Amino acid sequence: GEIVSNEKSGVCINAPAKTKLQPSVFHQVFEGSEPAVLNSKDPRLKTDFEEAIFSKYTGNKIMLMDEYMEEAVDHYVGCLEPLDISIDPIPLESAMYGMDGLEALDLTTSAGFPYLLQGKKKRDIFNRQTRDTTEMTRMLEKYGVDLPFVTFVKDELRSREKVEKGKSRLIEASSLNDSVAMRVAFGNLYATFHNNPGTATGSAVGCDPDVFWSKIPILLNGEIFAFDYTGYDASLSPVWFACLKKVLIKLGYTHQTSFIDYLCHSVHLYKDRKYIVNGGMPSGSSGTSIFNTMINNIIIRTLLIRVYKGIDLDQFKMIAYGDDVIASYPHKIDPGLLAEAGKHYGLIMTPADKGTSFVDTNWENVTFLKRYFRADDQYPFLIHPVMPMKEIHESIRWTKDPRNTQDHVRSLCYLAWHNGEEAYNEFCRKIRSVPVGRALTLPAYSSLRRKWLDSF
């Protein structure tokens, strides 16, 4: 992603609010390092604010698809075909309200241009209960599609370096109109993927880690390697979008590449500004996560081929959620080498195995979706999704709405127990060393562990 232009938008797009992050009744009970920089004049910046949040954009590797890419596409198109992905579009009411494999469109995310400036809240239009499918149809009529991407900073916690640096995350929110039409072209694609995490889709988008993480080592089973990217969604040159376009063709798609063109060449509204981006995937589009994940299936296949000349991908399996990869192949590979030839397409990647001094990525030290893996003692064949306590600790020190504390820790509890009884005792002990949590309902270890085995 690279910014080709920026000019006066024509809109006085609303400056954001203050943050909603306040220290929690556990801010002093657990140890941690605070909410994201949301304006220039925040007292905590050590470099130019506006400069750090668009530096995600690093430039394109402008080019035509090379011979490796074209083969990676065919292998992935052929991994997908058993999943029979209807090119047909879903009815409008299915896009809006949902269907099997597709939740209802989410009511809280913004509607973006040009609604957010005209007093049309999506609460008004949508009206779940009646499944009313008439408002949008005249909304899409009034404004069409291919509409700008309203840009909000993410309201979230970040590490200290990222607050000091100003490395805050942006939401590039597409329009409701855009959302719906997309949801109508690829709904049964979304649906297909959502109902089928694993090696075929090569995806875990919409997986339950509590019950899907045990499937994970059976499908990979070979010699695993994993990767994390740096500024991934922005490190995408237009070409990868074309490889996605090429995949989608072999799935039998036609005029619906329009949508990926909607993502490649992107037009975003910041404040009183209109910047245009060529290459780089927007975070707010109705399939951002799905399309990121397919491109990552293309990227990886390409890197092996380009690197290991004689190669058979039939016995090659991978699983991506956005930028998070984890992959298998019978025989050993140098992920450091894929990371290398990956720079030749302008992509900064980092494998788990960092070098010969470094212990091989194994099932004990590898991660995915921020979680490590660990087999149960009793039923080893069952894999815990283990989230670091550090991660939970940092999660608990701050609150959005202190009235939503009970569910906000219960939600944390269902994640924390996979670290073991003793650690869960430590955790609940710490919680009940402070007035507020002493009355708090907590799930006991045995209850959580029972509920988990019944997920199967």
Shortest spacing between CB 288 and ligand NDP, in angstroms: 4
Assign 52 to helix, strand or coil.
Answer: helix
Which residue number, 199 or 288, has a Cβ lying nearer to ligand NDP?
288
- Order the strands of the 170-173 sheet from edge to edge: 2-8, 273-278, 265-269, 149-153, 170-173
Shortest spacing between CB 206 and ligand NDP, in angstroms: 3
Residue 212 to residues 203, 217, 293, 378, Cα–Cα distance (Å): 12, 10, 17, 18
Q: Distance between CA 351 and CA 447 in Å, rounded?
A: 37
Shortest spacing between CB 125 and ligand NDP, in angstroms: 13
- Order the strands of the 223-230 sheet from edge to edge: 317-321, 324-329, 223-230, 348-351
Which residue number, 110 or 365, has a Cβ lying nearer to ligand NDP?
110
Whether residue 32 is annotated as binding a ligand: the answer is no
Which residue number, 10 or 16, has a Cβ lying nearer to ligand NDP?
16
What is the DSSP annotation of 404-441?
Answer: GHHHHHHHHHHHHGGG-HHHHHHHHHHHTTSGGGGG--
Which residue number, 315 or 404, has a Cβ lying nearer to ligand NDP?
404
Whether residue 272 is annotated as binding a ligand: the answer is no
CB 373 within 8 A of CB 386: yes
Assign 392 to helix, strand or coil.
Answer: helix
Shortest spacing between CB 179 and ligand NDP, in angstroms: 5
Whether residue 132 is annotated as binding a ligand: the answer is no
- Where do contacts with ligand NDP occur on this chain (CB under 6 A)? 103, 105-106, 109, 171, 179, 205-206, 208, 283-290
Shortest spacing between CB 18 and ligand NDP, in angstroms: 21
Q: Distance between CA 233 and CA 150 in Å, rounded?
A: 17
Which residue number, 290 or 431, has a Cβ lying nearer to ligand NDP?
290
What is the DSSP annotation of 198-250?
Answer: BTTTTB-TT--HHHHTTTHHHHH-SEEEEEEEESGGGS--HHHHHHHHHHHHH
Which residue number, 179 or 214, has a Cβ lying nearer to ligand NDP?
179
Whether residue 411 is annotated as binding a ligand: the answer is no
Question: Which helix (DSSP H) or strand (DSSP E) does residue 370 occupy?
Answer: none
Shortest spacing between CB 190 and ligand NDP, in angstroms: 8
Give the single-character DSSP code of 50: H
Q: Which residues carry a binding-site annotation for NADPH?
A: 106, 287, 289, 321
